[PDB]
Each structure stands twice: as structure tokens, then as C-alpha cells.
């Protein structure tokens, strides 16, 4: 008792925490490991107090968290722990437990390979405490472990261990019973063969435990049944309706944990094909139950005095959003009656929950809701002013979920009142209503567009005011709102009275922020929306903005190089700085057009751009390719020298695995065509084949297809002798794309391409000439220049095939098309 009797009093005084020992003894110990475990395991008999003995064990627990575990005396602690996992004093047992669990969690401890083998072996103990102490640690380890546990870590085949776990479902105490269920649950997603072969046993045993008085067993059963829904659907399908009715009861469970875990069942079931048919009959009972879980109570006092990221309220609501998307209109009979009372009922809480329901319903049952909108929208606009903060918040959201309908009616009746009321809500409330209103307004902007121009001064005063009013969190939501405005109003925003108020706060944040602060992302993305909309109005600001953006890109690239050469010595850069600076540069390029040429000429932007296009990160390439097309269009003078360099990369990136990169590549190629003319010829081979491949590819987003259709067209218009050879292969999808798109200068230029391509290879269209006619028939108002081309081609084929064949062919026509083409082009 030389080192021990001195250390035994340094923890006894460390307990009595005044101002002295809370800083003196806490820092004295942190400058040992062996004796602390001697105190927790050996002296923690009569000799010392339990609180004292467990405390030295807990400082040890904190010590473990590198040079401590790699030591050879770590083996003494570890040995000492497993000797008494089942200590009769619950406190010391609990200490040993968190000490074991922590040591093992220190990097999947393979310096402790005796651990799991000894634990599984200790499950078969007779001392309940030893059994439950081991099962306790085993559960925590199974759950923390990133991988699942092999027979190599266990020292028994899972073929033995899985059914051994299932045995403990059948008898022990409730503690063990759930320890057991938790353990077997760790083997469901990995589809462990041992478990799959023991499926019917696991399931049978699960039903046996369903109804267990202990909540922890119950939630584990729900948790288990949810996992099996995704992994092993075939074995639940026979018992489904019987499972559903169990889960329905569990969603309603006395205990909030079980309720949430059960509630997750519906979210999971909804994702499965069978969901529609299987659930129908239970809707009469499920929906009333979900809706009920969507109020609050204890929650309530926390929000006005935040709450959890995920809980029963959000889950039920989330479940209801999905279910709506499943049944759509068919759901409304089950929801509307209940919704009718809620929306007006009680005060505060019951009403709020009804407003939540209405928004949740939206996406799914949008069509079936239209009828009820003319009377509900005004009631919601009316609710925006409610006395209670939380009723205002949810109302903002629910309205945003019907923004599209509001926009489609006469702007005076719904939009104007809503927009007026929304602009008010953005300010002065609490932080929660600010966020909801501002966010909701950004949605409305995106949907309204030109319709906002009337109110632009009042809009712009609101948002700019909020800049001073708001605070970090809500400010990022404001950035989005200002950004959306710019986008949704375009050049209309360029007026000195608007510029002189919007710019100063944006520049203030610009100078305040430093290049390493991730607060630049929302700010700069905002400015790229603004610079584009303000066009040449941005001129006074472009100089410093450009210079900074290039620097950010240069530095990110530089940092990425260092990291590549010395991964263990240089930190990888946050590439979001690069993605954002590129996007702002492209926004300058669009708004400023030719006025950017000097800045580009005098910079090293294109050299940098070149490395960006080669970056591993799709988002980085995507940004640069957009910038490429923007520069191609604004100052090709400076781009052209690099055309030989960029095109091979452009060709590589014509790969639809990354829809957004491939789109921007495609779009840049076409914009390069316009610019080069007949010089494009050498480059077409490395591009055309891939483009015809993606236009012919099934299940491809409308945007990608359209851009490919325009790019082929432009490549045609510029090199007919190159692209026409392949006309027969792409015209079918080509027409299909641009057929649905309205008239536009871009669609115009793609057709002019097809026309010059036909007038070289008329054979290429014959096989699908039907579509090319439909394509010509889609045009509501062609330019006089285009009209002639279409006639000369259409009549030109009537001339070739013969008047007899032309009549028989133009008979299989859908009737309106026959009339459309007959009237408009004289057929």
C-alpha cells in the first residue's frame, strides 16, 4: 500500500466536487491504469465503498480513449474484467460492463480475441448475473461492430450460435429474453446463412414473444419484424394480415419506443409492391391511428421553452405521406371525414395536427384535393395569422405543398393574398415561423416566376430586411429564397433601385467570410443566381468576384495534389469550395456574356478548368462542363485554342451512369458546334456514336434526351456529311423527345439540323418518316424560315414515293395529325 494507499485517497477527494477538486483532482489524474482496475475488482470488497470503487473503474474507462491499450498491463485489466462480469453488486457489474464494452470498441479489438469466445461461453453460466452480464456485453458489441460477427471471431459456428440465441427467447428473465432478440437481429440484414436456414424457428419464436409484458422485448420483436420485411418477405407473406393487426396495436402501444418501432413498419411495408393489395382492408383502422400519433404534448412545452430528429409524430406523418403516394385518390374516403373535423376542431393542437395531415396528403392525393382547395386555401391563408406560433409554422408548410395550384388560378384570388401574407410571416415571428415562411416562399417563387414581378419591391425589401433580422440557421434558408427569386424573375431584377439594396448585404457577407468557411457555399450559390439575373448590372462587382472564384478553384486543386502525393501528411480539400466557385463563374459567364472575355484572357481559368474536368468527383466535372459551355458561348476567342484538348474529355464523360455530368458534356458539345461550324468535322467521330447510344437508351430523363436531341441537331446543321450517315439510327427517339417540348430558338436550331441532314441522306428518314411528320406537326408557330424547309422536304417525299403511295400512307395517320399536317403544310 505505497502507490495504492496514495491513489485510493486521490479518488476519494475527487468525488467531493467543489470548485477545488473539480479542477484539481480531475487534472491530477490526467497526467495508473493498473491500480484503478485493482481498486474496482479487488478492493471493491468490504475494504472500500462501491461508489469509490466504481469511480476508479470509470476514470479508467475514460483513460481508455492508445498508449494505454497497446501496453502489456492492459492484459491485466482485461483479464480482471472477465473474472467478474457477474459481480453481485449491480453498480460494479455495470462498471465492468462499460469498461469491457469500451475497451473492445477501441478499433474492433483483435488484441482481445478471447473476448467473444468467452462471452458466448458465459451465456451458459448458472449465475444469472454472469449470464446477463455476458449477454449484456455481447449485445452492445454485436450492435457497435461495423461488420457482423464471423465464426472466426466467435469460436463457434453460427449454425450453433444462432439457435443458441433463439433458446433464450423461450425461458429466461425479460432482460435476457430481449438481449437475445437484439443479438439475433444483428444477423438479419447481412442475410446470414445460419439465420436463413433457421428462419422458420426465428419467426415462430418471434410470434411467441409478441405479447411479452416487457417493452424492450416487444420493440425488439417489432424491430425484428421490420427488418425481415425487406430481407425475407417470402416467409412473412402467409402471416401478413395477422402481423399487420399486431403492428396496428403496437403503433398504439403504451410505450413510446415500441410505438415508434412499430410505426416504422408502415414506412417499410409501403416500399414493397404487395403493399397496395395487402393493406386496403386495414386502412379503415390504420389511418385513424397514424393521424392520432401526429399531435404532441410533452413535446409542446419543449418547443416553446428543440425535440428529436425522429419520433412518433414525424414517423406517422412520414408514413401518411407515402401511403398517400400509394393509394392516391383512393385514400381520400379514409382521410377526408377525419380531416373535416380536425381542420376546425378544438383550439391549437388538434387543429395543428389537421394542418399537418393536409400537407402530408398533398403530393399523393393532389388531384382528389383540387375540388376542396377553393375553400381550404383561404382558410389556410387565414391560419397564417393564428395566435399560436406552431400553427403559423405548419400552415406555411402545408400551403407550400399546394403552391402549384395557387399559381395556376388567377393571381388575384389566391397568389396575391397568400404572397402578401407569406411576406409578413417571413419576419418578426419566432425562429420556427421565419424558417417555415421563408422556405415556403422560396417554393412559391419557383412556381410563380413572372407573376412576382408586380411585387418585386415589396419582396426585395422583405428578404433584405431579414438579412439584419435573421441569425445563422435561418440565414441559409434566406440565401435559398434570394437565389430562387433571381432565378424566377431573371433580368427583371436588373434595375438600379433593386441592385442598390440587394448587393450591399451580399458584399458585406462576402468580405466578412474567409476562404476556409463553409458558409461560402450558400452565399456564392446565391450570387451565381444573382449575377445571371442582373446580367450587365453585375458589372461593377464582377472584377473581385471572378478573381476570388479562380483562387478558390486553384487552391482546391493545389490542396488535392498535395493530398494525392502525401495522403498521410496533407488533408484532402473540401471540394465544395471548388464546385461553388465554378458555379459562380459560370453565372458570371451567362449574365455578362462577352464582357467577361478580358477577365478570362488575363487569367488561367481554362488551364484550371481542364484539371476540373478530369476530377474524380462527378459534381466537379458537372460544374466545369457547364462553365465550358458558358465560356464557349461568351468568349469562344479564348476557348477555341483548347478545343482539341477538351473534346476527348467531353467524349469520355458522355457516360449516362452520371446523368448530370453526361448532360452538361452533351450541352457543351452542341454549343461548341454552333461556334466552330465546319471545323467541328474532325471531332465528330469521338462523340457522335456515344450520343446516338444515349438517345436510343430506354429509361433516360427527359432533360438528357432533349439536350442530346439538340446536340445531334447542331452537330448535323454544322456537319451534315458526318452525321447524316447515321440519320436512320437516331431519328425515332429524336422526334419523340422534341415532339412534346414547346417552340423555342433551341428546338428551332435542332430541326434546321435535321433538315440539312435529310437533304443529304433522304433514305435515313423513310423507315421512320411517320415520326418526322409528327415532329413537324408539333410546331405551333414556326419561324417563316423553318416553314419553307419543312414544306420542301415533305412535298419532296410526296414527289418521290408517288401520289398513290402518299395517300395510302397518310391514311394510317391518327386523325388529328392527318388534319394538322394537311392544313398547315398543304398535304
Amino acid at each position: 500500500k505505497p502507490d495504492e494507499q496514495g491513489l485510493q485517497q486521490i479518488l476519494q477527494l475527487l468525488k467531493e466536487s467543489q470548485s477545488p477538486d473539480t479542477t484539481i483532482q480531475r487534472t491530477v489524474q490526467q497526467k495508473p491504469d493498473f491500480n484503478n482496475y485493482l481498486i474496482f475488482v479487488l478492493t471493491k470488497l468490504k475494504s472500500e465503498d462501491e461508489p469509490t470503487r466504481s469511480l476508479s473503474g470509470l476514470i479508467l474507462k475514460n483513460n481508455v480513449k492508445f498508449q494505454n491499450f497497446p501496453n502489456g498491463v492492459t492484459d491485466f485489466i482485461k483479464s480482471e474484467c472477465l473474472n467478474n462480469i457477474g459481480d453481485s453488486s449491480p453498480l460494479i457489474r455495470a462498471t465492468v460492463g462499460i469498461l469491457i464494452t469500451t475497451i473492445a470498441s477501441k478499433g474492433e479489438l483483435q488484441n482481445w480475441p478471447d473476448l467473444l469466445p468467452k462471452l458466448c461461453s458465459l451465456l451458459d453460466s448458472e449465475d444469472y448475473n454472469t449470464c446477463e452480464g455476458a449477454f449484456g456485453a455481447l449485445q452492445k458489441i454485436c450492435e457497435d461492430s461495423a461488420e457482423i460477427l464471423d465464426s472466426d471471431v466467435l469460436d463457434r459456428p453460427l449454425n450453433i450460435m444462432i439457435p443458441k440465441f433463439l433458446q433464450f427467447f423461450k425461458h429466461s428473465s425479460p432482460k435476457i429474453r430481449s438481449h437475445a432478440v437484439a443479438c439475433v437481429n444483428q444477423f438479419i440484414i447481412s442475410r446470414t446463412q445460419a439465420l436463413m436456414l433457421h428462419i422458420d424457428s426465428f419467426i415462430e419464436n418471434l410470434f411467441a414473444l409478441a405479447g411479452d409484458e416487457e417493452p424492450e422485448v416487444r420493440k425488439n420483436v417489432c424491430r425484428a419484424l421490420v427488418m425481415l420485411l425487406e430481407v425475407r418477405m417470402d416467409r412473412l407473406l402467409p402471416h401478413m394480415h395477422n402481423i399487420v393487426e399486431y403492428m396496428l396495436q403496437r403503433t398504439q402501444d403504451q410505450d413510446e419506443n415500441v410505438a415508434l418501432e412499430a410505426c416504422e413498419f408502415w414506412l417499410t411495408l409501403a416500399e414493397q409492391p404487395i403493399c397496395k393489395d395487402v393493406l386496403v382492408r386495414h386502412l379503415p383502422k390504420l389511418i385513424p391511428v397514424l393521424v392520432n400519433g401526429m399531435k404532441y404534448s410533452d413535446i409542446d412545452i419543449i418547443l416553446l421553452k428543440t425535440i428529436s430528429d425522429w419520433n412518433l409524430r414525424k414517423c406517422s406523418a412520414a408514413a401518411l405521406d407515402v401511403l398517400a403516394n400509394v393509394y392516391r385518390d383512393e385514400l381520400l374516403p379514409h382521410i377526408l371525414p377525419l380531416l373535416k373535423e380536425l381542420l376546425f376542431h378544438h383550439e391549437w393542437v388538434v387543429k395543428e395536427s389537421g394542418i399537418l395531415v393536409l400537407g402530408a396528403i398533398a403530393e399523393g392525393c393532389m388531384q382528389g384535393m383540387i375540388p376542396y382547395l377553393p375553400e381550404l386555401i383561404p382558410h389556410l391563408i387565414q391560419c397564417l395569422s393564428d395566435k399560436k406560433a406552431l400553427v403559423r409554422s405548419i400552415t406555411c408548410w402545408t400551403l407550400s405543398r399546394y403552391a402549384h395550384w395557387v399559381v395556376s388560378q388567377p393571381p388575384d384570388t389566391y397568389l396575391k393574398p397568400l404572397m402578401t401574407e407569406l411576406l409578413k410571416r417571413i419576419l418578426d415571428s419566432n425562429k420556427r415561423v421565419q424558417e417555415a415562411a421563408c422556405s415556403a416562399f422560396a417554393t412559391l417563387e419557383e412556381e410563380a416566376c413572372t407573376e412576382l414581378v408586380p411585387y418585386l419591391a415589396y419582396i426585395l425589401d422583405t428578404l433584405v430586411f431579414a438579412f439584419s433580422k435573421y441569425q445563422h440557421k435561418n440565414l441559409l434558408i434566406l440565401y435559398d429564397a434570394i437565389g430562387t427569386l433571381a432565378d424566377s424573375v431573371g433580368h427583371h431584377l436588373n434595375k438600379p433601385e433593386y441592385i442598390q439594396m440587394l448587393m450591399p448585404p451580399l458584399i458585406q457577407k462576402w468580405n466578412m467570410l474567409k476562404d476556409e468557411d463553409k458558409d461560402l457555399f450558400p452565399l456564392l450559390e446565391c450570387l451565381s443566381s444573382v449575377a445571371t439575373a442582373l446580367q450587365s448590372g453585375f458589372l461593377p462587382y464582377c472584377e473581385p468576384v471572378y478573381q476570388r472564384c479562380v483562387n478558390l478553384v486553384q487552391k482546391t486543386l493545389a490542396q488535392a495534389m498535395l493530398n494525392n502525393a502525401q495522403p498521410d501528411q496533407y488533408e484532402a480539400p473540401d471540394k465544395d469550395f471548388m464546385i461553388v466557385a465554378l458555379d459562380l463563374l459560370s453565372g458570371l459567364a451567362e449574365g455578362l456574356g462577352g464582357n467577361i472575355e478580358q477577365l478570362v484572357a488575363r487569367s488561367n481559368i481554362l488551364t484550371l478548368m481542364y484539371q476540373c474536368m478530369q476530377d474524380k468527383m462527378p459534381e466537379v466535372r458537372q460544374s466545369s462542363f457547364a462553365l465550358l459551355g458558358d465560356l464557349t458561348k461568351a468568349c469562344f476567342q479564348h476557348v477555341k485554342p483548347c478545343i482539341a484538348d477538351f473534346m476527348p474529355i467531353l467524349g469520355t464523360n458522355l457516360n449516362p451512369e452520371f446523368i448530370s455530368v453526361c448532360n452538361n458534356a452533351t450541352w457543351a458539345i452542341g454549343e461548341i458546334s454552333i461556334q466552330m461550324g465546319i471545323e467541328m468535322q474532325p471531332y465528330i467521330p469521338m462523340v457522335l456514336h456515344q450520343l446516338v447510344e444515349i438517345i436510343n437508351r430506354p429509361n433516360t430523363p427527359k432533360t438528357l434526351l432533349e439536350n442530346t436531341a439538340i446536340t445531334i441537331g447542331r452537330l448535323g446543321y454544322v456537319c451534315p456529311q458526318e452525321v447524316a450517315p447515321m440519320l436512320q439510327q437516331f431519328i425515332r427517339p429524336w422526334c419523340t423527345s422534341l415532339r412534346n417540348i414547346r417552340d423555342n430558338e433551341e428546338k428551332d436550331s435542332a430541326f434546321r439540323g435535321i433538315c440539312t441532314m435529310i437533304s443529304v441522306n433522304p433514305s435515313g428518314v423513310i423507315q421512320d418518316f411517320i415520326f418526322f411528320c409528327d415532329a413537324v406537326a408539333s410546331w405551333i408557330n414556326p419561324k417563316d424560315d423553318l416553314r419553307d424547309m419543312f414544306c420542301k422536304i415533305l412535298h419532296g417525299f410526296k414527289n418521290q414515293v408517288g401520289d398513290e403511295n402518299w395517300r395510302r400512307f397518310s391514311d394510317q395517320f391518327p386523325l388529328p395529325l392527318k388534319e394538322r399536317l394537311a392544313a398547315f403544310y398543304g398535304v
Partner: peptide, 23 residues
């Protein structure tokens, strides 16, 4: 079947931060 055009680059600017929502 009529539509609005999607010609142009896709700027997936996921740095604007709208409200996650009630759920």
C-alpha cells in the same frame, strides 16, 4: 402533349438549404 424546355446545363446546386420540413 405540351411541355416547357429543359435545354441547358443541369446545375444541381445542393447548397441552397430549404426546410427539411415537419418530417
Amino acid at each position: 402533349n405540351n411541355q416547357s424546355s429543359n435545354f441547358g446545363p443541369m446545375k444541381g446546386g445542393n447548397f441552397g438549404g430549404r426546410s427539411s420540413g415537419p418530417y
